[PDB]
Design a protein around this ligand. Structure first.
Ligand SMILES: [Zn+2]
Lengths: 97, 42, 112, 36, 539
């Protein structure tokens, strides 16, 4: 699954939840992968896509809303986009996911 | 003299039992409430 | 405990004529008609009150300087800051998408 | 207090201090009960 | 296997060299089961017995993580740190820092250095000196007590954003009710995404409070193995100090640690025992020291290093009970059982290293002594009763204490203050049934401290004066100190004025109480009716 890898990343790796943190990490070049929820607004989604193209950061389109993505991460609040600074113990980066 | 010790031990134990029960009740209620709230946005 | 009444032709409790009671320097209570309150200018995109613009009656804007009814930013005095930011971002992204689509069309028509 | 658990100032203060006492006591309450 | 070579992640060559020079001949089970995981994206919760390699067990992964995350490089920023280490007492943190320095001794040159800084409350260095040398020296390891590290982190010159490793030693004590207020703030300042290591010999007691630290991917670790003797004596309180003497000059030991409830008690009884030794009451090659936690830091360090360095007795509070290890300690005496029983195992735990022949003794008040032993038994602790004769007391000991108190009024003040402090300390006691204020031998305890009058307390008035039958007036009692003698005489000459000030304060408090006018009205009615009945019944 993809939820197990995300949960392992949150448990052991390094991550940023939210649009502002994701954009800041994209600017700083510390992002390895950005997971985008399907519920995010179109303008912010396009801005994130352009920033990822500029920073050459891999993009994964999550199959669910921001609340499903928040539950997958392990937080009881909605998250619209996640950025993976360090995979840590998990292998989400290796499997092209 | 010892009646006060017996009374306060019994009272604190009953309070602890009621606290455990009410925490279990509220935990179930809020978990159901947050699940329903999270699912209502779609 | 003195009673006062309208000072103009209209005898009805209409929105146009509203009365306040004031004590004049003669020691007596007298009525005074109050004008309609001014409404803050609103943004043309979201309808929120514009920041940094004085609130006046429609004809009172003709007598004040331009700094009291504008903002130094583009669209200042017509649209708020967030709406202008969205407009800039949207325009740039639309232009980029047009460029990408044109390149894609050039490539897909280059096969033949 | 929003649920009308306290009826005036003294009740709230007494509840706070009693909560402090109980939060001091609960950890040893179980072993004391087992001892008797 | 317990071999350094066959560990999972192939420890760094200089860490291995430091280990080999230090030795240990192998790696302990704690270091075998904690180092692979604390450096492997897992938070750690470790319970282990005292002196089982725990300090190195959380120091080696710290250095491994520091090297791994490129903390020892020019890329590392200024005013930033990598790892934090917290301990409940200053001596424990200084000892941890000494261990880290010993490990870093063999750190190779020709590379960006790795340094540590100790942040403890001291009278030799303000927090601004700490900030200045933190900026100048740029360390990657911080070690300290919660108060000074909280003050240090609150300074705007220090940035905590690059921290990636937090270690709490004696984590059950740092999550205690008293320390939780400071540690909550300390963890609030630091980033949440980090690796946490909690280490404590009684980590099970802090049951659900470990998640207050913010563990992410945790693994609890429990390590288990007659090393030492646990005794107790049930005697009248007024004899307790005498019994202490009868142990000091008769038992066989190299180091004896005597625990006292309060700091003022430590100083007061230290002075009185020194006075007894002046008169040659106890004749032995014993050097007696006092060490409580309210001293200046330099004095505490000097006293501890003098005691650690020939037969020595230490009068210490619970500061020295936990963590610190003084070798060659033979005897441990707990003049009173501790306020919390969890620390009891620590107080008598200073001995028994490598199954050494060491004895622990405790004293009981004869009233509710039937409850302490079964309480420890339920907690899997067996206390074998010891019978000790009260040698050298026929009639004079309390008389000697009393006539020594009469020499200086400062001695009287210290004694009464210590007695009242002990009464307050007994008031804050867990296991209320075992330690009852009502059943407390107030007269016995007062006789123990040499006092000749019960201080005005609610406890004394309710649950129970002149111990010396011919009373002594305070007017002829001389303070013996020139500066304060004139102040006392001035206050004596102003007795009526201060009394009237307090009288006016009392009247104003009367008028400011709840519905005071109504209370005066009710008193008027009651007084009139009662004084009418006082004659109408007689007539
Ligand atoms: Zn707008």
């Amino acid at each position: 699954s993809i939820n197990q890898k995300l949960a392992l990343v949150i448990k052991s790796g390094k991550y940023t939840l939210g649009y502002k943190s994701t954009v800041k990490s994209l600017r700083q070049g510390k992002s390895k992968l950005i997971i985008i929820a399907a519920n995010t607004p179109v303008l912010r989604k396009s801005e994130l896509e352009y920033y990822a193209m500029l920073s050459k950061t891999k993009v994964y389109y999550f199959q669910g809303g921001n609340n499903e993505l928040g539950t997958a991460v392990g937080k009881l609040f909605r998250v619209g986009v996640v950025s993976i600074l360090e995979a840590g113990d998990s292998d989400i980066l290796t499997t092209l996911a | 003299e010892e009646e006060q010790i017996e009374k306060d031990l019994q009272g604190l134990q009953e309070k602890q039992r009621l606290n455990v029960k009410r925490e279990r009740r509220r935990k179930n209620e809020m978990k159901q409430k947050e699940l329903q709230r999270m699912q209502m946005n779609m | 405990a003195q009673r006062v009444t309208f000072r103009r032709r209209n005898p009805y409790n209409t929105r146009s004529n509203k009365i306040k009671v004031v004590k004049t320097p003669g020691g007596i209570l007298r009525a005074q008609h109050v004008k309609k309150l001014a409404t803050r200018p609103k943004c043309g995109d979201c309808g929120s009150a514009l920041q940094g613009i004085s609130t006046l009656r429609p004809r009172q804007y003709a007598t004040v300087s331009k700094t009291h009814k504008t903002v130094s930013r583009a669209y200042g005095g017509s649209r708020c800051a967030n709406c202008v930011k969205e407009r800039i971002i949207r325009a740039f992204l639309i232009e980029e998408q047009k460029i990408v689509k044109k390149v894609v069309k050039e490539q897909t028509e280059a096969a033949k | 207090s929003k649920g009308n658990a306290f009826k005036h100032k003294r009740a709230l203060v007494e509840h706070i201090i009693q909560a402090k006492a109980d939060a001091q006591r609960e950890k040893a309450l179980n072993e004391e009960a087992e001892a008797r | 296997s317990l071999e350094w070579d066959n560990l999972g992640f192939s420890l760094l060559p200089w860490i291995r060299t430091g280990l080999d020079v230090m030795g240990f001949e192998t790696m302990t089970p704690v270091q075998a089961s904690t180092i692979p995981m604390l450096a492997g994206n897992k938070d750690v919760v470790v319970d282990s017995v005292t002196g089982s390699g725990k300090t190195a067990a959380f120091v080696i992964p710290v250095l491994e993580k520091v090297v791994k995350e490129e903390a020892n490089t020019s890329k590392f920023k200024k005013a930033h740190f990598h790892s934090l280490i917290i301990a409940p007492t200053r001596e424990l943190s200084r000892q941890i820092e000494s261990v880290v320095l010993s490990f870093l001794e063999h750190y190779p040159s020709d590379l960006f250095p790795i340094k540590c800084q100790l942040l403890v409350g001291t009278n030799e260095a303000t927090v601004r000196d700490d900030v200045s040398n933190f900026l100048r020296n740029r360390p990657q390891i911080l070690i300290g007590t919660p108060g000074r590290v909280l003050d240090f982190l609150q300074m705007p010159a220090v940035k905590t954003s690059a921290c990636s490793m937090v270690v709490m030693d004696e984590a059950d004590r740092l999550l205690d009710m008293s320390f939780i207020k400071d540690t909550e703030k300390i963890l609030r300042l630091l980033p949440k995404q980090r690796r946490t290591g909690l280490f404590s010999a009684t980590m099970r007691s802090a049951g659900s409070d470990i998640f207050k630290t913010g563990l992410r991917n945790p693994v609890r670790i429990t390590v288990n193995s007659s090393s030492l003797k646990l005794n107790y004596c049930v005697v009248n309180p007024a004899e307790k100090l005498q019994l202490l003497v009868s142990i000091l000059n008769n038992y066989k030991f190299k180091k004896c640690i005597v625990y006292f409830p309060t700091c003022v008690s430590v100083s007061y009884f230290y002075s009185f025992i020194q006075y007894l030794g002046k008169r040659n009451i106890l004749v032995n090659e014993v050097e007696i020291f006092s060490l409580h936690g309210k001293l200046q830091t330099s004095a505490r360090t000097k006293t501890l290093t003098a005691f650690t360095d020939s037969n020595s007795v230490l009068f210490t509070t619970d500061v020295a009970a936990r963590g610190i290890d003084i070798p060659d300690v033979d005897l441990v005496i707990q003049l009173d059982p501790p306020t919390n029983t969890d620390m009891f195992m620590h107080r008598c735990g200073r001995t028994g290293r490598a199954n050494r022949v060491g004895k622990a003794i405790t004293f009981l008040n004869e009233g509710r002594e039937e409850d302490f032993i079964p309480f420890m038994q339920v907690k899997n602790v067996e206390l074998e009763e010891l019978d000790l004769e009260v040698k050298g007391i026929t009639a004079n000991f309390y008389e000697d204490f009393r006539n020594w108190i009469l020499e200086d009024r400062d001695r009287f003040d210290k004694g009464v203050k210590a007695y009242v402090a002990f009464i307050k300390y007994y008031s804050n006691h867990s296991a209320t049934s075992i330690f009852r204020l009502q059943s407390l031998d107030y007269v016995g305890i007062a006789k123990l401290y040499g006092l000749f009058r019960l201080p005005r307390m609610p406890e004394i008035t309710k649950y129970l004066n002149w111990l010396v039958d011919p009373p002594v007036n305070m007017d002829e009692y001389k303070y013996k100190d020139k500066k304060r003698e004139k102040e006392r005489q001035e206050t004596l000459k102003n007795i009526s004025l201060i009394n009237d000030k307090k009288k006016l304060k009392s009247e104003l408090k009367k008028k400011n109480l709840a519905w005071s006018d109504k209370t005066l009205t009710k008193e008027r009615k009651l007084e009139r009716k009662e004084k009418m009945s006082l004659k109408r019944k007689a007539i």
